[PDB]
């Protein structure tokens, strides 16, 4: 009947509970059968049956409000979400997606498709500010959980909601993609701090696809071309290799077929 569901709450959130969540998500996003340079590859979009296409991440807070997010298992990205009797979807880029998302939350009373997409550029201009000016951590997650919930009742406005998306995507999608960003959130969560992300986190987000390509295109682990990146102090450094990334990126989109038996 329903796609797989992962449960998480911000109530009593520890570093432990957060990490065992993000791990459980990763468990559902990939089998782990496709692993290249030690890194799990996301299932290939082409030929993928609609019934394996999405996963469900349910989020609740101390107020006991809950929302369920839909993640595409091919890009590990949020395509929409449900709160109570209403379901909301980001504007599809093509016919094929538009079809796919009709297999989600089919029992919901009301179904809305946004006139806008869920890409960062779009969300930033709606919420009124950049990812860098938007804070993260257990507290900003609790508020976003609520704002998404009360949107269906008219309680939430657009910029506030947009910002709420930016937060959850990063804390969940981005967190699942990168063990590094998972660590950045662990930090925040552990001490109950809240802070906007640094240039390193942001650039990693912008670079996910390209890294995925280079890695699967690599020659015995060596890139054909480097990818620019920033550390926390916003200074650039170039990545010519794989072994650097293994501690960083947890999942990869599917660029091409796996490698030969050798390595």
């Amino acid at each position, epitope marked *: 009947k329903q796609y797989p569901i992962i449960n998480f709450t911000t109530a009593g959130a520890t570093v432990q509970s957060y990490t065992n969540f993000i791990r459980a998500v990763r468990g559902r996003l990939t089998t782990g059968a496709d692993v290249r340079h030690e890194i799990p590859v996301l299932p290939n979009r082409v030929g993928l049956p609609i019934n394996q296409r999405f996963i469900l991440v349910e989020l609740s807070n101390h107020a006991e409000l809950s929302v369920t997010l839909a993640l595409d298992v091919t890009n590990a990205y949020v395509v929409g979400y449900r709160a109570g009797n209403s379901a909301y979807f980001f504007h599809p880029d093509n016919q094929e997606d538009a079809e796919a998302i009709t297999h989600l939350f089919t029992d919901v009373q009301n179904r*809305y*498709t946004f*006139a806008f997409g869920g890409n960062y550029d779009r969300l930033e201009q709606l919420a009124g500010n950049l990812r860098e000016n938007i804070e993260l951590g257990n507290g900003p997650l609790e508020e976003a959980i609520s704002a998404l919930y009360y949107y269906s009742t008219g309680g939430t406005q657009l910029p506030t909601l947009a910002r709420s998306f930016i937060i959850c995507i990063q804390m969940i999608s981005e967190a699942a993609r990168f063990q590094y960003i998972e660590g950045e959130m662990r930090t925040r969560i552990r001490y109950n701090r809240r802070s906007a992300p640094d240039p390193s986190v942001i650039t990693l987000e912008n670079s996910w696809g390209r890294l995925s390509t280079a890695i699967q295109e690599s020659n015995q682990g060596a890139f054909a071309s480097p990818i620019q990146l920033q550390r926390r102090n916003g200074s650039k450094f170039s990545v010519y290799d794989v072994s650097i990334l293994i501690p960083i990126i947890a999942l990869m989109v599917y660029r091409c077929a796996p490698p030969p038996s050798s390595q």
Partner: nanobody
Amino acid sequence: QVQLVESGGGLVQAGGSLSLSCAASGGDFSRNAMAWFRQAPGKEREFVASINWTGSGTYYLDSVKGRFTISRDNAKNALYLQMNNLKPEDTAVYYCARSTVFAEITGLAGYQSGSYDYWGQGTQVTVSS
């Protein structure tokens, strides 16, 4: 600034035909969900037809089902309502309504006047005999 203007209204006889047009401007039309409603005096405002942002998914009030056809030209920034076998019941002021927030609205919400932020001035449809 978003604009909604309906034309094509008038008077016809039971069985007669009409072609309705809404001229929309401003905003991004090609990404906006759209519908037609109607209201007769003394009567509550009733849903008529809805159409998503792409060419096709569409819903009708069953009284009008098969008699009426809603369409849109996203290049022309235009919405259309075709009314063919016309009845005295169909007499009412017809309004076009836009949602700039939503590309598509289905399920219960699709019939609710509340879910659409922009409305047109309206055009009168009277049917005789």
